[PDB]
Nucleic acid binder design. Structure first.
Length: 683
DNA sequence: ATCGATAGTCTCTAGACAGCATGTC
DNA sequence: CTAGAGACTATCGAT
């Protein structure tokens, strides 16, 4: 007994404490691979075995005295998978978590056996020369199939390549979904694999068309005439939970309100109607509360993260009979349900276009509650036209092959700078060797000298990289890389901010010009954005012609900045939302993005001498005018309580303490205490 | 010198990661 | 390309 048997027994004893309470992972062929120390690629329809299997590999690696870094594509998953690994703490394992949003202070992190983070975060931790990042022996990359994503793809390819180039003894384990070329991923990873299509709960896929649903169980079908609003009530009655995937927030909300009529006559939460209107109210939030009360609920990126968890939790508790969602919880958090309904195979992406088979297969895969249903259902609602595509290409078709997307100017540019800053390349030559270990190369055997030299020349002009004897980063480049922003973003900032100083909207708009920023949509009615931009024109870093074929992209930037302006000029949240035609989740998202960029704009601004943006970042973070900054730094003191106090003479921690009695009248007895309680600590 | 219906037309459309350092009403 | 709901408008007609 060296370490192999020990880990296996420990893993065994542990499986017993869980197998009694998540089911069973048959075939030790996989579990054998787990304790093989060799790189492994697990491909399985459900995340079921994938994670558990993955947990053992890290516990095993933990026991040998190594550290594993479990990488995820989403913040939520990082949490879910975090609170989940909180169990292996028993055996003396220290869990961790590091997002660009949240980080565990629970333990010294660099002393954890399992550090959970997000892909881009993991990449950033490297960029920012983390210390523990260099003591990671096992790298588990969950959702490795996202390698195909035009957005997330390249980062996974780069993350892995950098990691491997470092710890040549690093063990890479990638968990993936089913897909024709999974073995190609495995080959690229130099890893034994294990492909299965096993599901804890079998899944029958159907096709509703013209009042007729036809299931598909094995070789024989089962036709039946039913309407959509019934397919739900059937499953609602069995308290099985129904998932209805819609293509637009408008669709999601519409449906949820109708289905509520049905659910209403089955349950009444009313208690949840509260936890939804808690954080925010107004149009959307109201409509959502009125759905949750009647037992229904729509779910999209417009809801606040709070309203999000509320709905998810309640759906499991059975309080919420139906959840009508968009692409959000499609691949987000684990939400089981006996039934699942795709209302459409299309989606707007340029034009109404059918989603990838993968997308559908990935939606229907949530159909089937492990340990409650003897079978899971996934119905596709289609019309005369695509019925055949639905059945032949979707219900019985195979998922598209995972294709690399790293071969793009933007992505090459974005990552090359990083590779040059972190030391992996130092000549256009090594830079290519680096891209040779990519999942793009092992998929195309193509050379990238043309673009790579192009990309590098770009960075050369922008002054992020200099060629003295070999490729080397400038202070700006190292800063832009460490800041994890698009080099174009950093160039816009550096260029503009070294030639002029900006006001509020000026610097705000500067942020909305950047590629990294999210921009609001200008509509028929935002005629006031044009006039408003005209007026502010001398305060903007540039001003296009009405005739410019880019004027509309300009108004989009402006509308976004104007929204950010109203946010830091202390405007009401719902007023903001109703004004710019956006929802609370949207506002918080937009705002949160702007702060990250605002911070970068400012660090680039300081290095170049400009100081007209200082104070803006903190303002955006809190959504207040400058005078409230001292008050909002205080815990429990936001934009509303801050104004209430400031306007009453209380304008800082001291004034808050010396007048505790006035404070309590102004902001609340409860709060007031908590607030003061906090002052005293940091004091 | 009119409100009005029916039909052709226009508008609109999912999601969500990063810095930094800890908590809105 | 592989859409479909809802707001918007025009265009003809009966009074």
């Amino acid at each position: 007994m060296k370490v192999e048997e020990l880990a296996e027994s420990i893993s065994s004893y542990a499986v017993g404490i869980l197998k009694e309470e998540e089911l069973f992972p048959p075939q030790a062929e996989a579990v054998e691979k787990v304790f093989s120390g060799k790189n492994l690629l697990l491909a399985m329809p459900t995340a079921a075995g994938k994670t558990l299997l993955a947990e053992m590999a890290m516990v095993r690696e933990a026991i040998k005295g190594g550290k594993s870094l479990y990488v995820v594509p989403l913040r939520a998953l990082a949490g879910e998978k975090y609170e989940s690994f909180k169990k292996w703490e028993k055996i003396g394992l220290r869990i961790g978590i590091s997002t660009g949003d949240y980080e565990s202070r629970d333990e010294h992190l660099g002393d954890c056996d399992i550090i959970v983070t997000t892909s881009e975060k993991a990449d950033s931790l490297i960029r920012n020369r983390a210390s523990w990042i260099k003591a990671v022996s096992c790298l588990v990359v969950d959702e490795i199939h996202l390698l195909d994503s035009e957005k997330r793809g390249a980062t996974l390819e780069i993350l892995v390549t950098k990691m491997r180039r470092m710890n040549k003894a690093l063990r890479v384990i990638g968990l993936s979904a089913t897909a024709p070329n999974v073995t190609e991923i495995a080959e690229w990873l130099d890893a034994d694999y294990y492909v299965s299509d096993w599901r804890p709960v079998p899944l029958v896929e159907g096709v509703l068309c013209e009042g007729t649903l036809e299931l598909f169980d094995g070789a024989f079908s089962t036709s039946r005439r039913v309407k959509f609003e019934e397919l739900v009530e059937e499953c609602v009655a069995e308290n099985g939970g129904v998932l209805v995937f819609e293509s637009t927030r408008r669709g999601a909300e519409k449906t949820a309100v109708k289905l509520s009529a049905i659910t209403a006559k089955y349950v009444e939460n009313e208690g949840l109607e509260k936890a939804i209107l808690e954080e925010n109210e107004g149009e959307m939030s109201r409509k959502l509360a009125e759905c949750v009360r009647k037992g229904a609920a729509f779910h999209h990126a417009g809801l606040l993260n709070g309203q999000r968890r509320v709905v998810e939790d309640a759906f499991r508790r059975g309080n919420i009979k139906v959840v009508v969602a968009t692409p959000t919880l499609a691949a987000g958090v684990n939400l089981p349900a006996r039934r699942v309904i795709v209302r459409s195979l299309y989606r707007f992406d340029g034009y109404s276009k059918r989603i990838k088979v993968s997308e559908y297969k990935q939606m229907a895969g949530r159909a089937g509650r492990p340990g409650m249903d003897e079978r899971g259902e996934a119905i596709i609602i289609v019309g005369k036209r695509d019925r055949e595509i639905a059945v032949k290409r979707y219900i019985f078709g195979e998922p598209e092959r995972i294709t690399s997307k790293l071969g793009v100017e933007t992505h090459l540019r974005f990552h090359s700078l990083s590779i040059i800053c972190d030391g992996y390349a130092k000549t256009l030559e090594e830079l290519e060797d680096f891209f040779a270990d990519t999942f793009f190369f092992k998929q195309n055997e193509i050379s990238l000298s043309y673009e790579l030299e192009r990309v590098v020349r770009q960075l050369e002009n922008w002054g992020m990289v200099v060629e003295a004897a070999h490729l080397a980063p400038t202070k700006l480049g190292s800063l832009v890389s460490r800041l994890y922003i698009d080099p174009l973003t950093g160039f816009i900032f550096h260029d503009v901010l070294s030639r002029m100083e900006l006001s509020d909207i000026g610097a705000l708009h500067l942020i909305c010009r950047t590629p990294d920023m999210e921009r609001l949509t200008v509509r028929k009615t935002d005629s006031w954005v044009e006039e408003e931009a005209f007026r502010l024109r001398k305060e903007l870093s540039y001003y296009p012609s009405d005739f410019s074929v880019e004027y509309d992209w300009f108004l989009s930037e402006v509308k976004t900045a104007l929204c950010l302006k109203d946010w830091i000029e202390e405007k009401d949240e719902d007023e903001i939302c109703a004004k710019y035609g956006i929802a609370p989740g949207d506002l918080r998202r937009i705002v949160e993005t702007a702060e990250w960029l605002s911070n970068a704009m400012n660090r680039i601004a300081e290095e170049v001498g400009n100081t007209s943006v200082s104070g803006l970042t903190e303002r955006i973070k809190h959504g207040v005018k400058e005078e409230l900054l001292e008050l909002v730094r205080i815990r429990h003191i936001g934009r509303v309580r801050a104004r209430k106090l400031y306007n009453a003479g209380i304008r800082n921690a001291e004034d808050i303490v010396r007048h505790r009695e006035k404070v309590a009248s102004l902001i609340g007895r409860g709060i007031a205490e908590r607030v003061v309680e906090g002052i005293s600590v940091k004091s």
